[PDB]
Design a protein around this ligand. Structure first.
Ligand code: AMP
Ligand code: AMP
Lengths: 159, 158
């Protein structure tokens, strides 16, 4: 089936790869030409242009991934998606806590802060390196995550 | 003692917090104007005098959590050259930077956007109606291989 990846930097390529593994066709949008694979559909331009999303089959796609590094444009897309393609589901890259609150305020709950999960994991590797069993090191990580994300939403919930 | 966190932006604070949860004392180094937080020194983390002040002599672990990839490697070398008893975890910006850590024998690193991207794509898969078990198994296999094959090809770096 059909997925639109807006932004194809370090973030969007990982997601792109992950999903093609299960055999989802992709339509990629990115600033600036590189070189590119057949076997996908690629348009160069501002992802926050409606004409361009429509060309990536935004009309009939199932999911839109927002994987660009510019946080204002990212929100600008979320709105166009709502305004014009309400049948489109949206996952989104959030830069930091503040950006994540803004997604929440527009009712986007499926996002991920870009450096958070790697930082948590670096800190799990840290804890093991100080001689904590991987089970306790990883349990520490989970409880830390769960709460941080929980409490991030809780406060968002009181707009 | 305990742990030296070099760089205290978004990356270093998460790690800082995680570890202080278990009660590890921290010495933080950062370039730039902070708001109040353990033991904090403002300056270039890639200065030896400054690491020494963060107790680099007697610390156990050094976390490299800064956004500048050249400085990051510059520290790794000083750590090797002068504090070989110091273990090192490190933030890598991208695949190319990860290859460079590897070339200096640093294997304990993490690409900054990688694990979040993988997870965004797991959330993607669930949203298209794949059970969280298969969605998450897809993620693992994807990771395991990517990191595996990264270590493989580090050897042909230019
Ligand atoms: N408005 C936009 N439309 C399309 N691509 C963008 C836009 N803003 C940023 N990008 C790209 O998004 C990617 C994010 O890069 P990275 O941090 O490497 O994932 C980069 O390739 C940028 O050039
Ligand atoms: N050479 C350096 N010495 C100390 N801190 C640094 C250096 N280079 C970057 N930083 C810090 O790295 C952090 C990057 O923020 P973030 O990308 O949120 O982790 C910032 O807090 C910077 O002040």
């Amino acid at each position: 089936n059909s997925v639109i990846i807006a932004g194809y930097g370090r973030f969007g390529q990982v997601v792109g790869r992950l999903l093609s593994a299960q055999g989802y066709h992709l339509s990629i949008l990115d600033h600036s030409p590189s070189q590119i694979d057949m076997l996908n559909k690629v348009f160069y331009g501002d992802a926050a242009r409606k004409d361009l999303l429509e060309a990536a089959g935004a009309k009939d796609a199932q999911l839109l991934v927002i994987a660009i590094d510019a946080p204002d444009k990212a929100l600008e897309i979320v709105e166009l998606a709502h305004k014009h393609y309400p049948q489109l589901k949206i996952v989104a890259r959030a830069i930091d806590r503040r950006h994540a609150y803004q997604y929440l305020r527009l009712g986007v709950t499926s996002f991920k802060r870009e450096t958070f999960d790697s930082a948590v994991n670096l800190g799990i590797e840290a804890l093991t390196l100080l001689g904590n069993s991987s089970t306790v090191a990883e349990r520490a990580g989970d409880l830390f995550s769960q709460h941080d994300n929980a409490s991030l939403h809780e406060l968002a919930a009181l707009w």
